[PDB]
Amino acid sequence: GDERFYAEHLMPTLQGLLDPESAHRLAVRFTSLGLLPRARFQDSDMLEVRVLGHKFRNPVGIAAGFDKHGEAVDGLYKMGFGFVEIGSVTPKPQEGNPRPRVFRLPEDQAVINRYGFNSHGLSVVEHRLRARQQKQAKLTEDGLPLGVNLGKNKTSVDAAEDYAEGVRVLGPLADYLVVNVSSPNTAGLRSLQGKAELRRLLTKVLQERDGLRRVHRPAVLVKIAPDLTSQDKEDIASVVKELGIDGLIVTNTTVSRPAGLQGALRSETGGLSGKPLRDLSTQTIREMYALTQGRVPIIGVGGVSSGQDALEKIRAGASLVQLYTALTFWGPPVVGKVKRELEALLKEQGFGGVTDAIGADHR
Ligand SMILES: Cc1cc2nc3c(=O)[nH]c(=O)nc-3n(C[C@H](O)[C@H](O)[C@H](O)COP(=O)(O)O)c2cc1C
Ligand SMILES: O=C1c2ccccc2C(=O)c2c1nnn2-c1cc(F)c(-c2cccc(CO)c2)c(F)c1
Ligand SMILES: CCCCCCCCCCCC[N+](C)(C)[O-]
Ligand SMILES: O=C(O)c1cc(=O)[nH]c(=O)[nH]1
Structure with a gap:
């Protein structure tokens, strides 16, 4: 009902009137103000997932980058997301890259962005989250956890200290933290995915995390690129298991340009x-799940806009999934759509619930 209206009329009209960055800002504002109908979809028990030390009422989250500064968290839960991830947040405020820096590829159901970690900074986001900290504690208890995605400043000399500062400042306010070493839009950042740099960096992050008081101690995940070599992936899997990293987010955006893109702005x-990232991401999930023997929780992300897309990532090894770009095309109704379709497919394929389907392709 709302799905067709948003998909065929409202969203195409917004896109026709507004450049993507302006449209994004408007989307965040409307979401923050709750200017959206409370999702009518009631999450069934078979969508519940217990992972990362928490209950998730459903496995569909909002990916990092939509609410970079923690301004729309409650509105995103209202939209029906089972968990919310904000960020990336950098230690100091920074403006990001010059405009234009976001582009729609409607013929490909894709977006290209080079925001460059535009961020209000840790202090501002800290105070935003503190203003609703107890509300979030209740939401988390009720199965709606919060993730905080950490980045590094453009002019930072010591990347590990940037991430450490993020752990110290926002770790106490997060159910999980994400060490984002896979943005394609910060020079040298992805090199932090290399084995030696990654081990040093993540050792420091986990030390800082372990130093927080117990009820303020988040899970720590690493978010990785889809563009890794086989060697890169082996090395990451090894470091993650060695250090006891709590999970992986798979994947960030790709700097590849798959054959067949039609968008003028490709x-x-x-x-x-x-969508052009969807199966690249799914295969990266599949590989990382195998390399970690299924013992390391994966949040799967990239090109999800249907129950089938979600279930493919879950069967490949994901315990949870996220989406972003689908929102920009389908609008808010896509969240209920994915959940409804996912429940139906689980039933069709004989799964008792999401948990039974995690990694099922490997078995
Ligand atoms: C405009 C835009 C901004 C993003 N910003 C971030 C970010 O700040 N940090 C991050 O880890 N991922 C960021 N991402 C990546 C998404 O979190 C996600 O990994 C990726 O877009 C694939 O999911 P999707 O195909 O559903 O959009 C951003 C993506 C887009 C499109
Ligand atoms: O190109 C982009 C884009 C690019 C890069 C990042 C983001 C976006 C992005 O958010 C977007 C785009 N084009 N349209 N939207 C967009 C616009 C909206 F108004 C809403 C929205 C949210 C809440 C309530 C209501 C009204 O009920 C509407 C929305 F979800 C998405
Ligand atoms: C082998 C992967 C090649 C690159 C990505 C493949 C994209 C598959 C097309 C499905 C997209 C649906 N739509 C509306 C976006 O065109
Ligand atoms: O801020 C950005 O440019 C950005 C960060 C990130 O992690 N991923 C992405 O696609 N963009």
Whole structure:
């Protein structure tokens, strides 16, 4: 009902009137103000997942980058997301790259962005989250956890200290933290995915995390690129198991440009998201699940806009999934759509619930 209206009329009209960055800002504002109908979909028990030390009422989250500064968290839960991830947040405020820096590829159901970690900074986000900290504690108890995605400043000399500062400041306010070493839009950042740098970096992050008081001690996940070599992936899996990293987010956007893209803006610099990333992401999930023997929780992300997309990532090894780009095309109704379709497919394929389907392709 609302799905068709948003998909065929409202969203195409917003896109026709507004450049993508302006449209994004409007979306965040409307969401923050709750200017959206409370999702009518009631989450069934078979969508519940217990992972990362928490209950998730459903496995569909909002990916990092939509609410970079923690301004729309409650509105995103109202939209029906089972968990919310904000960020990336950098230690100091920074403006990001010059405009234009976001591009729609409607023929490909894709987006290219080169925002460059535009961030209000840790202090501002800290105070935003503190203003609703007890509300979030209740939401988390009720199965709606909060993740905080940490980045590094453009002019930072010591990347590990940037992430450490993020752990110290926002760790106490998060159910999980994400060490984002896979943005394609910060020079040198992805090199932090290399084995030696990654081990040093994550050792420091986990030390800082372990130093927080117990009820303020988050899970720590690493978010990785879809563009890794086989060697890169082996090394990451090894470091993650060695250090006891709590999970992986798989994947960030791709700097590849798959054959067949039709969008006029396909050769813009930046990370590509949406459908052209979908199966690249799913295969990266599949590989990382195998390399970690299924013992390391994966949040699967990239090109999800249907129950089938979600279930493919879950069967490949994901315990949870996220989406972003689908929102920009389908609007808020896509969340209920994915959940309804996912429940139906689980039933069709003989799964008792999401948990039974995690990694099922490997078995
Ligand atoms: C405009 C835009 C901004 C993003 N910003 C971030 C970010 O700040 N940090 C991050 O870890 N991922 C960021 N992402 C990546 C998404 O979290 C996600 O990994 C990726 O877009 C694939 O999911 P999707 O195909 O559903 O959009 C951003 C993506 C887009 C499209
Ligand atoms: O190109 C982009 C884009 C690019 C890069 C990042 C983001 C976006 C992005 O959010 C977007 C785009 N085009 N349209 N939207 C968009 C616009 C909206 F108004 C809403 C929205 C949210 C809440 C309530 C209501 C009204 O009920 C509407 C929405 F979800 C998405
Ligand atoms: C082998 C992967 C090649 C690159 C990505 C493949 C994209 C598959 C097409 C499904 C997209 C649906 N739509 C509306 C976006 O065109
Ligand atoms: O801020 C950005 O440019 C950004 C960060 C990130 O992690 N991923 C992405 O696609 N963009």
